[PDB]
Amino acid sequence: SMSYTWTGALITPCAAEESKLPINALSNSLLRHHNMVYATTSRSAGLRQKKVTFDRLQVLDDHYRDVLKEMKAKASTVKAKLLSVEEACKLTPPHSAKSKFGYGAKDVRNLSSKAVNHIHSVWKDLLEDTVTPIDTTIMAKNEVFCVQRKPARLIVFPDLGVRVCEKMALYDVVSTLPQVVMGSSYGFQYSPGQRVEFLVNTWKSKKNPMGFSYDTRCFDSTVTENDIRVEESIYQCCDLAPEARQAIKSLTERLYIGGPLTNSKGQNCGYRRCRASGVLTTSCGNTLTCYLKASAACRAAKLQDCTMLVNGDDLVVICESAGTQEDAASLRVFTEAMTRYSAPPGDPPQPEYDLELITSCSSNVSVAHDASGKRVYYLTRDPTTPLARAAWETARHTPVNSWLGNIIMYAPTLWARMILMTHFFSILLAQEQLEKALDCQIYGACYSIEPLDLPQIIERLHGLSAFSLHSYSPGEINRVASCLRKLGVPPLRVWRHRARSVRARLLSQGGRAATCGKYLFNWAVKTKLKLTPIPAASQLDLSGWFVAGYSGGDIYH
Ligand SMILES: COc1ccc2c(c1)S(=O)(=O)NC(c1c(O)c(-c3ccccc3)nn(CCC(C)C)c1=O)=N2
């Protein structure tokens, strides 16, 4: 069937949207080429509608069913708990979109009786009714990039009351099942370093390693009614409370499979027969589905000792080469299979023979050296989007603070230590706002984070190594440098200078601020202070930071 059908009503915005980067007194210290940075808006959603709208054919064979049966056997070992209304309420982000039934995110969080009542009545309707399509809102995401212009991405989500019910029903499943079904292929169980560890061990466990990422064209749109029912039959394999079995079947029929789309104004826009981007099971379902399809395809294309790493719609395979000609021909077959399974490619896939060239989850493995001279592997990416967003966040307060997320996930990197950290700690000092907790996203989930805790976080996730890395590779250095010429970011000798000031200012405050100066900015000085383990390190509740994926699933931890 058709992924979408459209009545012709436009995708409308809530507030005014800004596409040109806002500029303040801090901007020029980061970025001169302001017109290179933009925010997508509802206004360009027609371009997106065009490309995500197509017909889907699907042809499922034995490799496909065999693997599905392998997955179900694992899922039948899983036991999920039905969350309480209160518990699901606590998992709602504070900035989550308000209900049309007259209550909001905070009324959910602080547990007001009006919100709890409506939620209960939504649950009860869910238990009694398994057919009635559930209303959803379609919006355009405001995201920020550098010119490469991309149309706004679409977000489709049900009402706040449904979103809470989803959590009651499925939060435990989507946190627990993916790991059991897909084992070490489940990308979201990994921190950055654990991911490098897995990619490196996988790579080097092959005689002659060949790897490739697979870029599906609009994964969401390629997901069919079949796919959604299949993944439901996977959820159903779990040991569940009778009320959870029921809610899951009903949410599958009324919501996950398809449903009407309403704009922010109340007008009807059309109908959806593919994955909704804004539901709880978005991450988990895409993952299970991508894995199911790629595992089968790898069999259909006779790939040798193939190892998969899956994150939502993001897929990378590492296997044994047969030479460039047989490798070239293996992937076309792999891609034909994926195509039959309704997962056609964007850019066709290309074999890589050097791990550092493999881009997956928008990151690559790279190498630098620790204080001992001991070669160390770490994860990095092209910093263009991180820096484009840092620019936006320099001038505008935002619901999610990506600069802080980028420091947590990309601490060992050159561009995150020398730029992100220097620039933003410089800003927090001027506002005296070091002690203030900020919101940031990790694998789709919102975390409230105190900047002063960064050293301990970084030590826990990356080891003291991360405060000592040096002699980065020429490929990494070049990309960072080339990215700065593009954006008009000051050269790295300026940031070193700024960082000496930023560090000394921090040392002066004493306490946590001086711990920040000592560890985050040790790189900046000629004669370095000695970095030992940190007393307060083993105090943070880092449980559930890298358990599962939650993107579009409206989750707060
Ligand atoms: C639609 O399916 C998805 C596919 C891929 C997804 C995600 C969803 S995600 O859960 O939004 N987060 C990430 C993700 C990040 O959010 C982030 C990230 C970046 C900056 C700030 C916070 C998180 N980083 N990486 C790379 C590092 C890890 C693979 C070790 C990511 O892959 N990737």
From Swiss-Prot:
<feature type="domain" description="RdRp catalytic">
    <location>
        <begin position="209"/>
        <end position="327"/>
    </location>
</feature>
<feature type="modified residue" description="Phosphoserine; by host">
    <location>
        <position position="42"/>
    </location>
</feature>
<feature type="binding site">
    <location>
        <position position="313"/>
    </location>
    <ligand>
        <name>Mg(2+) 2</name>
    </ligand>
</feature>
<feature type="binding site">
    <location>
        <position position="314"/>
    </location>
    <ligand>
        <name>Mg(2+) 2</name>
    </ligand>
</feature>
<protein>
    <recommendedName>
        <fullName>RNA-directed RNA polymerase</fullName>
    </recommendedName>
</protein>
<comment type="function">
    <text>RNA-dependent RNA polymerase that performs primer-template recognition and RNA synthesis during viral replication. Initiates RNA transcription/replication at a flavin adenine dinucleotide (FAD), resulting in a 5'- FAD cap on viral RNAs. In this way, recognition of viral 5' RNA by host pattern recognition receptors can be bypassed, thereby evading activation of antiviral pathways.</text>
</comment>
<comment type="subunit">
    <text>Homooligomer. Interacts with non-structural protein 5A. Interacts with host VAPB. Interacts with host PRK2/PKN2. Interacts with host HNRNPA1 and SEPT6; these interactions facilitate the viral replication. Part of the replication complex composed of NS2, NS3, NS4A, NS4B, NS5A and the RNA-directed RNA polymerase embedded in an ER-derived membranous web.</text>
</comment>
<feature type="modified residue" description="Phosphoserine; by host">
    <location>
        <position position="29"/>
    </location>
</feature>
<feature type="binding site">
    <location>
        <position position="215"/>
    </location>
    <ligand>
        <name>Mg(2+) 2</name>
    </ligand>
</feature>
